[PDB]
Structure formats: structure tokens, C-alpha cells
């Protein structure tokens with residue numbers, strides 16, 4: 316219950332709205348030009364922009380000079396094959412689509428090559444950018460490409476495949492929103508497409524499931540009550556809490572920047588944990604504005620338990636553990652645990668620094 320202070324922090328974050336908005340505009344102008352270029356290419360005919368991520372969830376609170384952008388590509392009749400026993404990684408094949416389809420230039424045997432596709436994606440964007448100081452492309456550190464706009468704004472660009480078929484079985488027990496949002500809503504959401512982003516596992520040519528569009532839909536229609544946050548009597552602190560969790564993690568990564576201890580943690584971990592706290596606390600009355608202090612403390616406490624037990628399930632794919640030993644070592648989780656505990660015990664000093 317340090318609610319008075321948390322409000323002041325939120326109020327401070329609002330002062331960044333204009334810079335972030337101005338920056339978003341420049342990114343948009345550039346990313347629109349790029350989309351027009353991509354659409355001229357045979358391989359990327361059904362390419363489109365996916366308006367997802369923190370900016371579109373109204374939850375981007377820092378870093379006017381950093382954006383993530385996702386392009387989507389409609390890929391009909393996809394066949395998936397699970398990579399090993401990872402529940403989130405897959406190989407991509409096609410259902411009787413061998414020829415007359417421009418995407419087949421990207422095949423290696425029967426599987427679609429992420430590496431070939433990304434290389435052509437990058438090459439197209441580079442060509443376009445080379446045809447036009449105010450926009451450059453950073454060289455490879457491996458998020459397909461990264462741009463620098465006006466020598467100032469860094470934009471990470473991700474290509475995603477869109478599949479309109481039903482979600483893979485590993486999502487069967489995920490998205491536990493039945494008692495928060497409804498069974499009805501869960502049914503409707505699961506009829507929507509899923510996405511696949513290029514992502515190495517273990518190793519190569521695998522793709523990882525992505526649901527950034529569902530995450531956006533939940534965040535922008537987030538109450539048990541259909542009118543949550545539409546009137547003064549129903550202002551909940553759910554987004555405030557998510558904002559504070561993200562800022563906490565950003566501020567900590569900034570503080571221990573010289574250490575490598577915090578490099579593996581990202582806002583996705585915070586966002587994932589936050590959705591789990593929404594599931595555990597399904598009623599809007601558990602997110603009363605006046606209880607901002609208790610609610611933020613639930614979020615922090617939840618996040619600490621994930622660290623201590625080394626378990627943070629992907630919200631969509633329950634068997635995919637974001638905090639497994641294979642992704643993040645015990646020492647890093649133990650370091651973050653200690654810092655969060657210190658921070659909580661001292662009314663969050665990093666919120667002023």
C-alpha cells in the first residue's frame with residue numbers, strides 16, 4: 316500500500332506520451348512505405364501490418380526511441396510439425412501446395428525455410444532503404460531487421476506467418492480466461508488466426524507460436540464487466556499495474572545495466588505474469604483504483620514466486636516454461652528476486668531514479 320507514490324509514478328509516465336506519439340508517427344510513415352514495397356514482391360503478396368504490441372495496447376510507457384513492428388503474411392493450408400517436445404516451436408509445411416505458389420521458392424525439401432524467407436525480407440527492405448540518411452538499416456547481430464529512423468529511433472521488425480486454421484493442440488489448456496472474460500469470449504478468440512514468428516530453438520528453420528493479437532484484444536477489453544473503464548464508477552487499475560510492472564523491470568535493467576544478470580528478462584515476462592494475475596483475480600472489484608497498492612503488490616508477489624520456483628508458463632501454451640533452466644539460469648533469477656525484494660521493502664527507490 317504505497318499507492319500515493321505509485322500514482323505519482325504513473326503521473327510522471329504520462330509526460331512521455333507526446334514524445335512516444337510523435338515517434339510512433341515517424342515509424343508509421345516509414346513502415347507504410349516498406350509495406351507498399353513488400354507488396355510489389357511476388358513472395359510477399361499477402362503481407363500486411365499487424366497493429367499489436369505495447370503501443371497499440373496503450374501500455375507503452377517509455378523509450379520513445381525504441382519500437383517493435385510486426386508484419387504478417389497470410390499462408391494458407393499450413394501443416395505443422397512440433398519440433399521435439401518444445402510445445403511452442405514448429406516446422407512449417409504445406410497441405411498439397413507444392414507449385415504455382417510464390418512461397419515455394421523458400422522451401423528446403425518439404426519444409427519452409429525461415430532463413431531463406433528472412434534473407435529475402437531483409438534484402439527487399441535493404442534495397443528499398445538503399446534507394447532512399449533519415450532511414451538506415453543496422454547490420455546483422457542475428458526480430459528480422461532493425462532500422463534507425465532519423466538517426467534516433469530504433470525499430471525492430473518481425474515477420475510473422477498467419478494461419479487461419481484452428482490453434483495447435485499445445486494451446487488446448489491455455490488462455491484460461493473462462494472465469495474472467497467468459498467461456499463465450501474464449502471460444503470467439505480461439506476462432507481467430509494464430510501467428511508464427513521465425514525463432515531458433517534448442518535448432519534452425521523452426522517457428523514459434525505468437526498471439527500478440529489476442530493479447531491486444533484482451534488488454535483493450537479487459538474487464539469482467541463489459542463497461543470496465545468506460546465510466547468513472549468502473550475505473551480499474553489493471554493497466555496501471557501492468558505499466559508499473561514494466562517500468563519496474565525497465566528501471567532495474569537500467570540500474571544493473573553493466574551486469575549481465577538482467578539481460579534475459581523482458582517485458583514479455585512481465586506481461587505474461589500479469590495475465591496470470593488477471594486469471595487469479597477475475598473480478599473487477601479485485602482491481603479497484605483505490606486498491607492500486609494492494610493490486611501492484613499482488614503482481615510483484617506473483618512475479619517473485621515465478622522467479623523463486625523457476626516457473627512462468629506462457630499464457631497460451633501452459634507446458635512452455637519461460638523461466639526454464641534452459642532459457643535463464645538460477646543465478647539470474649536469484650539476482651532479480653533479491654533486487655525486487657529490496658525494492659519492495661523500501662518503497663521502490665528505482666521509481667525515482
Ligand SMILES: [Zn+2]
Pocket residue numbers: 537538543544549550551552553
Ligand atoms: Zn478496466
